[PDB]
Amino acid sequence: VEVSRSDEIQKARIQLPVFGEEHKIMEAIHHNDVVIICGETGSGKTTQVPQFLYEAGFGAEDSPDYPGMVGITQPRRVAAVSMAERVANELGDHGHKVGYQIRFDSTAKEDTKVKFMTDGVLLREMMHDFKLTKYSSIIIDEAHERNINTDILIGMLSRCVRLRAKLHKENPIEHKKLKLIIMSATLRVSDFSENKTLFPIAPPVLQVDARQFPVSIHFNRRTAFNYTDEAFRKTCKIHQKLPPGAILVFLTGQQEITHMVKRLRKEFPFKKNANDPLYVLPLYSLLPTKEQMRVFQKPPQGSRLCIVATNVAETSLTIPGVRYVVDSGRSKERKYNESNGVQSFEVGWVSKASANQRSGRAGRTGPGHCYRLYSSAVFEHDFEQFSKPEILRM
RNA sequence: UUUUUUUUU
């Protein structure tokens, strides 16, 4: 199968170190019933999978009615949409042959081989069905967050695939076996691979690296009673001491963030061409789009960037021209008193996965200086390494 | 005597 590619996007095909590993994906699409592949983002996994499975012999495997076509599920609607104006142009075919579906935009075209999903739309489709005949190649995204809907869907697809791992008809050879790879976002999914519950077999796994684009991890053995002022001091020390760039100041809630915005408008009130060139912007997804496009833009000249954000920045929104974080130390979380029906908004330990993703959010392609207001001994006491499931709270 | 970071149909 050929793709009708383009020049700069063939530059985007070869550059990824997973396309040369295509044969593994080939055996992963030909040998194993369920495959688990992990890796940090930016290593060319979602931006390389449609070129795998459009060229795998699965677009027309069980042809001529097209029941072999890949659905790749995404954490959220904007991830699928942005990735569709990213890599549906990577396969050189129009919107009929590559597409997406989100909560309120359905692009159900019959020519399609690659479809980017959320969780809920595919739930909608296979409570509308139960045996998943129209699909044969499925790729999962974000296996490390372990949300509600990802876990729900993976349990019920384990049921459906292991029901179709059996014989389709009265002992045929034409089985509607479903080929599925979980393209993870961070490199610990083995907490599910050890179990014999969701699959009694051990699911075969593949581990791939990424491009670090280095970040310097720095621990401050400091009291973290008012982590706002500590983050303020670390970002002032980077802004004055270290070479220029952009620095991230991270917090938890609604009020400390605008308090830090007021302060960085106070001690650095100039923002035009105390000659510290600085533009300071808050960020969380409870802000309107005009401020959300204000951070999409680059800083005005005579001013660097500095972003006072909550814990949104790890996964929700990420911006190009930043270098360094000062972490939250402790992040805001929510839990329910099941003995009462009492909810809660509180602040507790950042797990090491969220902090690592945060440090990666700092050093996109440039140097990172992860000035952590907490210590290594406090990073010793940020167990567990990964975050706890979002199921257990609600 | 308001104290909502976050999310999937």
Q: Which amino acid is present at A377?
A: A
**Residue A252 labelled as part of a binding site:** no
**For tokens 């210590």, what's the residue?**
A375
Q: Which amino acid is present at A363?
A: G
Taking the C-alpha atoms of residue A42 and residue A210, their distance in angstroms, rounded to an integer, is 7
DSSP A271: -
Nearest residue to A278 (alpha-carbon basis) of A249, A300, A253: A300
DSSP A21: G
**Residue A376 labelled as part of a binding site:** no
Give the max Cα distance, chain A: 81
For A233, residues 6+ apart whose C-beta sits below 8 A from its C-beta are none
In contact, A132 and A165? CB cutoff 8 Å: no
Taking the C-alpha atoms of residue A6 and residue A12, their distance in angstroms, rounded to an integer, is 10
- Looking at chain A, the residues that come just before a C–N gap of over 2.5 A are 273
Nearest residue to A152 (alpha-carbon basis) of A194, A122, A176, A111: A122
User: Which residues is A250 bridged to in the sheet?
Assistant: A309
- State which approach was used to obtain the coordinates: cryo-EM
User: Which residues is A183 bridged to in the sheet?
Assistant: A37, A141
Distance of CA A169 to the CA centre of its chain: 39
C1’ B8 / CA A140, Å:
14
User: Kind of pairing, strands A137-141 and A179-183?
Assistant: parallel
Q: Let me know if A171 is exposed, middle or buried by CB neighbors in 10 A (0-12, 13-18, 19+).
A: exposed
Taking the C-alpha atoms of residue A16 and residue A367, their distance in angstroms, rounded to an integer, is 21
**For tokens 């049921």, what's the residue?**
A159
Query: For B6, which residue's CA is nearest its C1'?
Result: A312
Q: Is the dihedral of CA A104, A124, A200, A54 positive or negative?
A: negative
Q: Phi-psi region for residue A142, left (φ > 0), alpha (ψ -120 to 50) or beta?
A: left
Taking the C-alpha atoms of residue A38 and residue A319, their distance in angstroms, rounded to an integer, is 23
Q: Let me know if A123 is exposed, middle or buried by CB neighbors in 10 A (0-12, 13-18, 19+).
A: middle
C1’ B3 / CA A163, Å:
50
**Residue A335 labelled as part of a binding site:** no
Three-state secondary structure of A309-335: ECHHHHCCCCCCCCCEEECCCEEEEEC
Q: How many beta carbons lie within 10 A of that of residue A365, not counting itself?
A: 10
In contact, A353 and A389? CB cutoff 8 Å: no
C1’ B3 / CA A255, Å:
8
Give the three-state DSSP class for A249.
strand
With b meaning 16 or more CB within 10 Å and e meaning fewer, what string describes A134-159? Answer: ebbbbbbbbbbbbeebbbebbeebbe
Q: Phi-psi region for residue A105, left (φ > 0), alpha (ψ -120 to 50) or beta?
A: beta
* Beta strands across the sheet bearing A278-283: A278-283, A304-309, A246-250, A324-326
**Residue A332 labelled as part of a binding site:** no
In contact, A250 and A277? CB cutoff 8 Å: no
Render A364-377 in DSSP notation, one character per residue.
SSS-EEEEESS-HH
Nearest residue to A16 (alpha-carbon basis) of A99, A94, A90: A90
Helix then strand then coil, in percent of chain A rounded to 5, is 30, 20, 50
| Token pair recorded at residue A180 | 């599925």
A161-164 long-range contacts (CB < 8 A, ≥24 apart) are A161/A33, A161/A34, A161/A132, A162/A199, A163/A131, A164/A131, A164/A132
User: Kind of pairing, strands A34-38 and A179-183?
Assistant: parallel
**For tokens 């709270």, what's the residue?**
A393
Resolution of the PDB structure in angstroms: 3.5
- Cβ-based contacts with strand B at under 7 Å: A 76-77, 102-103, 118-121, 123-124, 147-149, 252-255, 284-286, 310-312, 316, 331-334, 345, 390
In contact, A272 and A288? CB cutoff 8 Å: no
**Residue A118 labelled as part of a binding site:** no
Render A64-76 in DSSP notation, one character per residue.
TS----EEEE-SS
Angle at A107 between CA A105 and CA A109, to 5 degrees: 165
Q: How many beta carbons lie within 10 A of that of residue A117, not counting itself?
A: 25
Q: How many beta carbons lie within 10 A of that of residue A201, not counting itself?
A: 12
In contact, A202 and A356? CB cutoff 8 Å: no
C1’ B6 / CA A332, Å:
9
| Helices marked H in chain A | 7-14, 22-28, 49-53, 77-87, 119-125, 148-164, 190-193, 227-240, 256-266, 289-294, 352-362, 376-380
In contact, A121 and A115? CB cutoff 8 Å: no
User: Kind of pairing, strands A105-106 and A98-102?
Assistant: antiparallel
**For tokens 């959320």, what's the residue?**
A118
C1’ B7 / CA A275, Å:
41
In contact, A222 and A234? CB cutoff 8 Å: no
